RNA sequence: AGUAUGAAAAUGAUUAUUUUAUAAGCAAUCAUGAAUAUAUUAUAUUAUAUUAAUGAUGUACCUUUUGUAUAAUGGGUCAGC
RNA sequence: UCAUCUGAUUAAUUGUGGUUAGUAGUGAAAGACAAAUCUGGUUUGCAGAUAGCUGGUUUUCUAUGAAAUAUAUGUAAGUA
RNA sequence: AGGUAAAUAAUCUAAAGGGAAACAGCCCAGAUUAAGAUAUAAAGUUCCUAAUAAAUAAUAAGUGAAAUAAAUAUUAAAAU
RNA sequence: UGCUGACAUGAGUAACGAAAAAAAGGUAUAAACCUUUUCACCUAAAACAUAAGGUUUAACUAUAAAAGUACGGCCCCUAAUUAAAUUAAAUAUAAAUAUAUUUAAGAUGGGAUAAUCUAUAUUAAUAUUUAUCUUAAAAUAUAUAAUUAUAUUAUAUAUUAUAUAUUUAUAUAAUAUAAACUAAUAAAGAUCAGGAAAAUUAAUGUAUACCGUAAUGUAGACCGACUCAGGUAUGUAAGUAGAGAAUAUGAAGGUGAAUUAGAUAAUUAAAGGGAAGGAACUCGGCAAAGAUAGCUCAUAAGUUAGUCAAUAAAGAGUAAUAAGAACAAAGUUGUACAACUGUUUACU
RNA sequence: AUAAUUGAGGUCCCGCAUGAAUGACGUAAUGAUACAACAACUGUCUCCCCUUUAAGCUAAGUGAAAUUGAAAUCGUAGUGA
RNA sequence: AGAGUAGAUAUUGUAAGCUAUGUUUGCCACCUCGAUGUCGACUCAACAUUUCCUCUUGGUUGUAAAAGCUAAGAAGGGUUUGACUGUUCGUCAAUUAAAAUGUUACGUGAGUUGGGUUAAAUACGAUGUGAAUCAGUAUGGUUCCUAUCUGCUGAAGGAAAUAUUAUCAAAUUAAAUCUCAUUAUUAGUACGCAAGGACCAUAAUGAAUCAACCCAUGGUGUAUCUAUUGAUAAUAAUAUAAUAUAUUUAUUAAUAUAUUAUCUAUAUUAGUUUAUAUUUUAAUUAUUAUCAUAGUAGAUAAGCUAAGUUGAUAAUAAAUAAAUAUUGAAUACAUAUUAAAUAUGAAGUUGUUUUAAUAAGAUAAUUAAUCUGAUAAUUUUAUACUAAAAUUAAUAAUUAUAGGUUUUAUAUAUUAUUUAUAA
């Protein structure tokens, strides 16, 4: 009751409802901006919900599965824009995370908001699809977009990629088919380059992407450690 | 409960500015953004790049505006007859001039 | 509640000089190094000026009182009246 | 304000309007009320009421320099 | 009784200075403006803190050394 | 505690005035504005109609449309009441003026017709309160020259069939729900004995004045020096519950606010829970605690005879057996004093 | 009556200084009046503990107040209106 | 003087005498008389010692013992809970080793209470012709303040450092701490006529106080699970209906999914609501959610707590107070020294012990492909903010801060009528 979670200056009933709302909004819009503390708590709920959904999907035990389903239902507000949220959770969202052991969200810190000095953050779903089956781009996966923008900038400058950038790319890849990842990167480039107004010679960009993928995939002192005399 | 004397210039100033707690600190923890080579806070996203990405998302993931057929195919004269102009209130006018009271985000300096 | 003008003060910030982190009180005067500033006879071993090294001595003012540092009284401070 | 307690068809509660007040009405009577409060409102005027009381009373220099006693005083915080 | 009632003297009151640790009234002494050599007053002269050296007793308790506490007991000392 | 002005100090301190927020987008500008969606609070209201009041506060300047019938005013008439008014000599009086009478004013009240729409004009004559019981009657069972039975009980409407007039007209019988509530009715209980004041036909008219009309009204749009937890009149006021406008919820509606974000030390307020005690506290059980139907029974002593006492207390049945909404319901007795129900120091 | 009672009730009557419409005395009923007793119940207490919310604390925004001779504002003894 | 068997000085102590004290009742008016801290309670104590108990010790025909009485040293520790009373006080009960006496603006409210004394109402006895009055009695009755300075409690930053840093730290200093009870043995011994009844000393209990801790116990637990009442709003599944795709098929049936929907309209004599017929496609189970004080109730992990657990009273020793001695002159004697030598002896003292503060000293590195810190991020052992501390791995290497996950365990409450696989 003290120390188990953030209190967030709200009465228990209100607080829980707020958290549910945040979770619903995260599932609907695959990224959302909010205050840092709220985002942190919301992540805990959303991740829990995702795991329960995964458990329901997997389990052979019928009673267990039913219980998981009931728990998931309890943890959401299913109305208006979130009428078919349960369906989405089972069919669209939870199947992304079957291999991933936890860590389905990422809270990314922003510059604190000016009017309030409140620490601001971006709660968002990990490995959200950047491109739907229709020829559009999807709202979400901000980190990936940022990475690709950084890559583009490095290419423009004719500089080597930073170790941190490479590490991030590797992390992104870990639960991604290589060809799919490449195609996503290419798609992101097309939009990003146009926005920034750099020229998109396609074959060269593809080659660069391929090169970036290759280095990611193929893995390759002051004090001396000496035994006791 | 109540101050016994007029607090002097010295004693108010040493109270306010003497302690380091009360002073402002240099923001040493700035560093370069990898997407655009500009200043940003450490362990923080660049507000320009994330803003740009948000804008891109908005432009792509855009719910189409509902233009009713009957109003779209009105004649100009007919439209004027139906929906004439009006004097807006002082309050309304003030609300309309958003650039007076609404702060757009500033761009940081380019890192060296 | 005219129009100018306005280096009037109180008061804010900043800087410069100078002093100040082992020293205890009307915060000044006097003594006395020191640092700095300016100086068209500093000839200088100069002069003045600014400045809480430093030591001595130093119980705001006013009213009212036999008698006040008084823990009696009035005043936040300056300008006008 | 909240928690509580009490009347809740009556000597009830309240709306609109009127009447009674500054020697002065109203008062199931408390010096209670008469426009944020009365042993008697407010404004204006008398009017610079009056104050043996309290405070204030502004530059400089010079020379002299007290008393706190006696007497009388509805006088003893005053005045001769 | 820092009391009260007068008498008398002085100071204060209205008097700055030196002394009495500090000090309205006590001890000295009266600032016209300086200055600082010469006498000094009251009071002091190991240090703080201006400035000294002696004789002769007596004390041993820090008595005492600028705010003298008694009847009485004791131990001494002279003398008769 | 001189006055006026300026500016200090406390101090960037306390505070930002009951509160539920989220997101996404307007809008690569939004804690604070708009839109959408989620959540929430109010709901015999924070809703919908209104009265009064007011810097028009409004969905606004291209602006709050009225011949009258669930429109008000204006207008007609009065109440309380008012009045340089009124009546050789109305009476009285330092003046002012006062009184009495007349007369004119005075809404909080009265006031014609009307959806099969309605016609106000000029002229001639000539209701304090309170109740709706009983009983009786009509009706479905019984039973079918019965007793029970429990409900029905004055009104308002359409329909059908007639019947009278010729498809209107009206009468006539025929079927037809529970609860509220309402209006016209009737007949009726008490003592506290219950306003004022403004013709008729007939004839002839009637080319329809002005004024309020927004929004706000349990409030940020009036009164409170403030966008002030105060004050502020009226009818409505989903349903489901219930005796009920109590209490829960809350369909719809309307809100979510001139501070946010974190944090939740000591400490204070407002709550919840608490082992063994059980008033040991303390001025004093102050505060808090305590409810074994709320219905139906049943209910003592005393006594002014009034279930006053009394909602008695306990106890009982309906419900309940581990417990498992809110709301009403909070013991008894002695004494002083006052009979009572009431009144009083608006702010000790 | 309590373990134990300046309270309470009953009673006594050298009534400091009761007494009859300033009404006397005694009941019932009533009382947000006052005092006391019992039961029941309790965080009132032994003895406090824990938790929830609003502050308090920190960041951002706006931004008071009484006060105030001037302050370079220690302790103790002594001192002194 | 006089008690005290016999004796003034075991204990007693008149009248007078001399002081002290500076608490009280006065007295003085010298403070302000804008000092309530309005006199009592509570909270909190600090201080004195003029010692109540506890430790040491003299005397005590009035010390056999034990109780005592009395006096010295001694303030280290400790010195109470109720009934009544506004009460300080006192009486009383029950205790305790004892229930000391004070000072501290009759300690203590810008910290509380407000019962008393206390203004405006009021009545009672008495007084006055009366208004009113009273040391009378009685019911009632409004207190404020966000801390500026000093001070105190903690906590940081800055800093000068016998000159760095990381770290380990001593002397000291600032504090704290220091007990006490009871039974048992020693012992029914000493001692006594018995009746009783020990010193010294030691152990075991306990007491009070302080400290730490959460393994258990109890508590709480707006973590959470289960149970349940009332309204309400969902999601799903299905039924239905319609639109839009797809499509068996031939526009349209059909097939499929997707969405959307579950109304509505009219009776029943005014209105309202409900009920049923009418109208219509206008649906009957899983599972949620909110609200109702966390809706109420039974449990309940951690945490924190105390009812609980654990620890501790800090030795030894040094010099001592009072007091008890040895030799011993001055002073043939005598005399423990206010001579020289020589001894004991206290819950006191100094130490010790513990806590904090500091930083002498110490080991170690010294311009940095990895120096010591700091800002930044993730947190907690820590915490108001700070401070402290954990971690910032991703590298051939070697470290998990937090969340998430996962595994075990706990909680909840059903469960073998079960869980999963055969073939």
UniProtKB/Swiss-Prot annotation, chain A:
Annotated GO biological process: mitochondrial translation
PROSITE patterns: RIBOSOMAL_L17
Keywords associated with the record: Mitochondrion, Ribonucleoprotein, Ribosomal protein
Molecular-function GO term, any one: structural constituent of ribosome
UniProt KW Ribonucleoprotein keyword: yes
Signal peptide feature range: none
One GO cellular component term noted in the UniProt record for this chain: mitochondrion
InterPro entries per UniProt: Ribosomal_bL17, Ribosomal_bL17_CS, Ribosomal_bL17_sf, Ribosomal_bL17m_C
Broad class of where this protein is predominantly found: mitochondrion
Location(s) in or outside the cell: Mitochondrion
Disulfide linkage: none
Function: Component of the mitochondrial ribosome (mitoribosome), a dedicated translation machinery responsible for the synthesis of mitochondrial genome-encoded proteins, including at least some of the essential transmembrane subunits of the mitochondrial respiratory chain. The mitoribosomes are attached to the mitochondrial inner membrane and translation products are cotranslationally integrated into the membrane.
Other known facts: Although this protein has evidently no mitochondrial targeting pre-sequence, it is efficiently transported into mitochondria. Present with 3000 molecules/cell in log phase SD medium.
Family matches, as PANTHER family: LARGE RIBOSOMAL SUBUNIT PROTEIN BL17M, RIBOSOMAL PROTEIN L17
Family to which the UniProt record says this protein belongs: Belongs to the bacterial ribosomal protein bL17 family.
Assembly and oligomerization: Component of the mitochondrial large ribosomal subunit (mt-LSU). Mature yeast 74S mitochondrial ribosomes consist of a small (37S) and a large (54S) subunit. The 37S small subunit contains a 15S ribosomal RNA (15S mt-rRNA) and 34 different proteins. The 54S large subunit contains a 21S rRNA (21S mt-rRNA) and 46 different proteins.
Annotated protein name in UniProt: Large ribosomal subunit protein bL17m
Gene of this entry: MRPL8
UniProtKB/Swiss-Prot annotation, chain B:
Gene Ontology MF annotations: structural constituent of ribosome; zinc ion binding
Signal peptide (UniProt feature, chain positions): none
Residues involved in Zn(2+) binding: 33, 36, 46, 49
GO BP, sorted A to Z: mitochondrial translation
Predominant subcellular localization, coarse grouping: mitochondrion
Other information: Present with 1700 molecules/cell in log phase SD medium.
Role of this protein: Component of the mitochondrial ribosome (mitoribosome), a dedicated translation machinery responsible for the synthesis of mitochondrial genome-encoded proteins, including at least some of the essential transmembrane subunits of the mitochondrial respiratory chain. The mitoribosomes are attached to the mitochondrial inner membrane and translation products are cotranslationally integrated into the membrane.
Name of the protein described by the UniProt record: Large ribosomal subunit protein bL32m
Shown chain mapped onto the complete sequence: 72 to 183 of 183
């Amino acid at each position: 009751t003290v120390g188990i979670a953030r209190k967030l200056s709200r009465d228990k009933a209100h607080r829980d409802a707020l958290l549910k709302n945040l979770a619903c909004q995260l599932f609907q819009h695959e990224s959302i901006v909010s205050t840092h503390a709220k985002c942190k708590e919301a992540s805990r709920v959303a991740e829990r919900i995702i795991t329960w959904t995964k458990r329901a999907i997997t389990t052979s035990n019928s009673v267990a599965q039913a219980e998981l389903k009931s728990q998931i239902q309890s943890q959401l507000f299913l109305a208006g824009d979130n009428r078919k949220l349960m369906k989405r959770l089972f069919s669209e969202i939870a199947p992304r995370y079957l291999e991933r052991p936890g860590g389905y969200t990422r809270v990314l810190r922003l510059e604190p908001r000016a009017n309030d000095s409140a620490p601001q953050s971006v709660l968002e779903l990990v490995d959200s699809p950047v491109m739907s089956e229709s020829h559009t781009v999807n709202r979400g996966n901000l980190k990936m977009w940022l990475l690709v923008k950084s890559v583009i900038n490095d290419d423009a400058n004719q500089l080597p990629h930073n170790p941190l950038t490479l590490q991030n790319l590797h992390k992104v890849a870990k639960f991604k088919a290589e060809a799919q990842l490449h195609g996503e990167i290419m798609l992101i480039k097309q939009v990003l380059l146009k926005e920034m107004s750099l020229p998109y010679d396609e074959a060269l960009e593809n080659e660069r992407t391929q090169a970036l993928l290759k280095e990611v995939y193929s893995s390759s002192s002051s004090y001396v450690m000496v035994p006791r005399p | 409960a109540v101050p016994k004397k007029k607090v002097s210039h010295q004693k108010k100033r040493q109270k306010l500015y003497g302690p380091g707690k009360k002073q402002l600190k240099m923001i040493h923890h700035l560093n370069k953004c990898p997407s655009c080579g500009h200043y940003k806070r450490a362990n923080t996203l660049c507000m320009y790049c994330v803003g740009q990405i948000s804008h891109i998302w908005k432009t792509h993931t855009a719910k189409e505006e509902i233009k009713p057929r009957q109003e779209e195919e009105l004649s100009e004269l007919d439209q004027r007859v139906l929906y004439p102009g009006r004097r807006d209130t002082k309050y309304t006018k003030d609300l309309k001039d958003k650039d007076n009271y609404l702060e757009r985000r500033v761009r940081t300096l380019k890192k060296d």
